[PDB]
Amino acid sequence: HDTLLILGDSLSAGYRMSASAAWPALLNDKWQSKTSVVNASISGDTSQQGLARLPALLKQHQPRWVLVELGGNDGLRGFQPQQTEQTLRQILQDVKAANAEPLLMQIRLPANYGRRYNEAFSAIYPKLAKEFDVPLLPFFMDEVGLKPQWMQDDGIHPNRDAQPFIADWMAKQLQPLVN
């Protein structure tokens, strides 16, 4: 009955698969009658789009914890790292002000983007985790990517088959935090 809210993009919503197929639904199943998992993710969401939806989610779901998994789409849509940092800062602030605990997931961009860019982008996550003194979960795609059979054709998004694994991985990361 205590709720974890997942505020994510495609990596949590599921890319070209249903609600029921994505790892949060599987985690919800695994944690039935202990912890409620509410998936508030939408494919393609930027950090700014996530923040826009946040006040209505906090009021509606009154979560105890909010897992923030955003930033991956920000560069592609014209937002610089410094803008992503500030947007995430604001998200963490709203979660704490609603007396929930923020959990930040580390995001990594494709090597493709540039070495100068990736270091700056990746660096905002530990910076904010330290600044707000919150859990920083590792980027699960670092592991999922090691199995081509778990990747959709685009080489970016985990497929249906990957979702049970990711649910297991999240359950383990989140266990000490949630009961």
Short mmCIF file of C-alpha atoms in Angstrom, two decimals:
data_model
loop_
_atom_site.label_atom_id
_atom_site.label_comp_id
_atom_site.label_asym_id
_atom_site.label_seq_id
_atom_site.Cartn_x
_atom_site.Cartn_y
_atom_site.Cartn_z
CA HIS A 1 0.00 0.00 0.00
CA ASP A 2 3.16 2.21 0.32
CA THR A 3 3.88 3.46 -3.22
CA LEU A 4 7.04 3.74 -5.29
CA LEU A 5 6.47 6.13 -8.21
CA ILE A 6 8.63 5.61 -11.30
CA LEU A 7 9.12 8.83 -13.24
CA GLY A 8 10.85 7.56 -16.36
CA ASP A 9 11.14 7.61 -20.14
CA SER A 10 11.18 4.63 -22.55
CA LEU A 11 13.62 2.61 -20.37
CA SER A 12 10.83 2.30 -17.72
CA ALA A 13 7.69 2.80 -19.85
CA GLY A 14 8.72 0.11 -22.30
CA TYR A 15 9.74 0.95 -25.87
CA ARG A 16 7.17 -0.37 -28.38
CA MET A 17 5.70 -2.81 -25.87
CA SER A 18 2.69 -2.60 -23.55
CA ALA A 19 2.41 -1.41 -19.98
CA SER A 20 2.08 -5.02 -18.80
CA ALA A 21 5.31 -6.10 -20.54
CA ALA A 22 7.60 -3.41 -19.04
CA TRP A 23 9.74 -4.14 -15.99
CA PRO A 24 7.76 -1.90 -13.51
CA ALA A 25 4.63 -4.05 -14.02
CA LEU A 26 6.75 -7.15 -13.42
CA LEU A 27 8.27 -5.60 -10.25
CA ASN A 28 4.74 -4.67 -9.15
CA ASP A 29 3.71 -8.33 -9.65
CA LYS A 30 6.71 -9.58 -7.70
CA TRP A 31 6.03 -7.14 -4.83
CA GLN A 32 2.25 -7.61 -4.64
CA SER A 33 0.66 -6.74 -1.26
CA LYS A 34 3.95 -5.24 0.05
CA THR A 35 4.88 -2.28 -2.12
CA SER A 36 2.85 -0.67 -4.85
CA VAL A 37 4.78 0.22 -8.02
CA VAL A 38 3.16 2.98 -10.11
CA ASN A 39 4.62 3.44 -13.57
CA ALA A 40 4.51 7.15 -14.54
CA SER A 41 6.86 6.78 -17.46
CA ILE A 42 6.27 7.84 -21.05
CA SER A 43 8.50 7.00 -24.05
CA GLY A 44 10.39 9.99 -25.37
CA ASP A 45 9.99 12.08 -22.19
CA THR A 46 12.70 14.66 -21.44
CA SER A 47 13.52 15.70 -17.93
CA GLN A 48 11.49 18.90 -18.49
CA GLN A 49 8.43 16.86 -19.63
CA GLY A 50 8.86 14.66 -16.56
CA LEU A 51 8.94 17.71 -14.30
CA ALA A 52 5.78 19.16 -15.94
CA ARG A 53 3.85 15.97 -15.00
CA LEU A 54 5.35 15.70 -11.51
CA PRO A 55 3.11 18.00 -9.35
CA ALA A 56 -0.08 16.18 -10.53
CA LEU A 57 1.56 12.75 -9.90
CA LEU A 58 2.71 13.64 -6.37
CA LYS A 59 -0.74 14.95 -5.45
CA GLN A 60 -2.47 11.95 -7.13
CA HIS A 61 -0.25 9.06 -5.95
CA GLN A 62 1.23 10.48 -2.68
CA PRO A 63 4.33 8.23 -3.06
CA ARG A 64 6.85 7.35 -0.37
CA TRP A 65 9.68 7.01 -2.94
CA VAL A 66 10.13 8.42 -6.46
CA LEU A 67 12.58 6.75 -8.82
CA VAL A 68 13.79 9.39 -11.30
CA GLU A 69 15.04 7.92 -14.60
CA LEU A 70 15.32 10.90 -16.96
CA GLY A 71 17.85 12.81 -19.04
CA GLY A 72 18.55 10.33 -21.84
CA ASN A 73 16.32 12.18 -24.30
CA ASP A 74 17.37 15.70 -23.31
CA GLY A 75 20.30 16.24 -25.75
CA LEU A 76 18.30 15.04 -28.79
CA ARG A 77 15.63 17.68 -28.01
CA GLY A 78 17.91 20.74 -27.74
CA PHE A 79 18.49 20.81 -23.93
CA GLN A 80 22.17 21.16 -22.82
CA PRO A 81 23.66 19.20 -19.83
CA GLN A 82 23.47 22.29 -17.60
CA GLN A 83 19.70 22.48 -18.38
CA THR A 84 19.24 18.77 -17.61
CA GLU A 85 21.12 19.24 -14.29
CA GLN A 86 18.90 22.17 -13.28
CA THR A 87 15.68 20.31 -14.32
CA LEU A 88 16.66 17.23 -12.28
CA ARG A 89 17.61 19.53 -9.39
CA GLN A 90 14.05 20.88 -9.51
CA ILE A 91 12.54 17.37 -9.67
CA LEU A 92 14.54 16.23 -6.59
CA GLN A 93 13.39 19.38 -4.76
CA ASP A 94 9.66 18.76 -5.53
CA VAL A 95 9.89 15.12 -4.44
CA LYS A 96 11.49 16.05 -1.08
CA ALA A 97 9.04 18.95 -0.56
CA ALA A 98 6.20 16.44 -1.04
CA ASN A 99 7.93 14.37 1.72
CA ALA A 100 8.89 11.47 -0.53
CA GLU A 101 12.45 10.10 -0.94
CA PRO A 102 14.04 10.64 -4.40
CA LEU A 103 16.04 7.79 -5.94
CA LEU A 104 18.15 8.91 -8.88
CA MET A 105 19.24 6.50 -11.61
CA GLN A 106 22.55 7.12 -13.32
CA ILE A 107 22.02 7.72 -17.05
CA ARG A 108 24.66 7.16 -19.80
CA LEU A 109 24.48 8.37 -23.42
CA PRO A 110 25.93 6.44 -26.43
CA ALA A 111 29.70 6.77 -26.97
CA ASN A 112 28.47 8.25 -30.29
CA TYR A 113 27.62 11.63 -28.66
CA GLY A 114 31.20 12.70 -27.86
CA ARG A 115 33.73 12.23 -25.05
CA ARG A 116 33.60 15.88 -23.89
CA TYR A 117 29.76 15.66 -23.84
CA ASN A 118 29.40 12.25 -22.12
CA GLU A 119 31.72 13.11 -19.21
CA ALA A 120 29.75 16.32 -18.54
CA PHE A 121 26.38 14.55 -18.94
CA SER A 122 27.20 11.49 -16.85
CA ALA A 123 28.77 13.68 -14.13
CA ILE A 124 25.53 15.48 -13.19
CA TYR A 125 24.06 12.30 -11.63
CA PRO A 126 26.68 11.73 -8.85
CA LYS A 127 26.81 15.52 -8.39
CA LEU A 128 23.08 15.67 -7.61
CA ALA A 129 23.08 12.42 -5.61
CA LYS A 130 25.77 14.01 -3.40
CA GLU A 131 24.08 17.45 -3.37
CA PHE A 132 20.72 16.01 -2.17
CA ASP A 133 22.27 12.98 -0.34
CA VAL A 134 20.02 10.45 -2.07
CA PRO A 135 20.50 6.94 -3.53
CA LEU A 136 22.14 6.85 -6.96
CA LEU A 137 21.26 3.59 -8.71
CA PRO A 138 23.65 2.40 -11.50
CA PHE A 139 22.42 2.48 -15.13
CA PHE A 140 21.01 -1.01 -15.68
CA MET A 141 21.57 -0.78 -19.48
CA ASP A 142 25.29 -1.23 -18.83
CA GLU A 143 24.41 -4.86 -17.99
CA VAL A 144 21.47 -5.37 -20.34
CA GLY A 145 23.68 -4.28 -23.27
CA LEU A 146 26.01 -7.21 -22.66
CA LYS A 147 23.25 -9.50 -24.07
CA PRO A 148 22.42 -8.72 -27.75
CA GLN A 149 19.41 -11.08 -27.36
CA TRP A 150 17.97 -8.51 -24.87
CA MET A 151 18.28 -5.48 -27.22
CA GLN A 152 15.75 -4.23 -29.76
CA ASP A 153 16.99 -3.64 -33.33
CA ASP A 154 17.88 0.01 -32.67
CA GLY A 155 20.67 -1.08 -30.25
CA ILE A 156 19.35 1.37 -27.66
CA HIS A 157 16.22 -0.05 -26.02
CA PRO A 158 15.83 -3.33 -24.09
CA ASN A 159 13.34 -5.76 -25.64
CA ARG A 160 10.43 -7.68 -24.04
CA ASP A 161 12.65 -10.58 -23.13
CA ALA A 162 14.94 -8.29 -21.10
CA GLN A 163 12.19 -7.05 -18.81
CA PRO A 164 12.13 -9.96 -16.26
CA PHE A 165 15.90 -9.53 -15.75
CA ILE A 166 15.60 -5.78 -15.25
CA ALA A 167 12.75 -6.27 -12.75
CA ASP A 168 15.02 -8.71 -10.78
CA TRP A 169 17.93 -6.29 -10.91
CA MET A 170 15.74 -3.43 -9.68
CA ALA A 171 14.16 -5.54 -6.92
CA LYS A 172 17.71 -6.22 -5.63
CA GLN A 173 18.88 -2.61 -5.92
CA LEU A 174 15.67 -1.38 -4.23
CA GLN A 175 15.35 -4.10 -1.55
CA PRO A 176 17.30 -2.33 1.26
CA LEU A 177 15.53 0.99 0.50
CA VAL A 178 11.99 -0.43 0.34
CA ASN A 179 11.46 -2.65 3.40
#
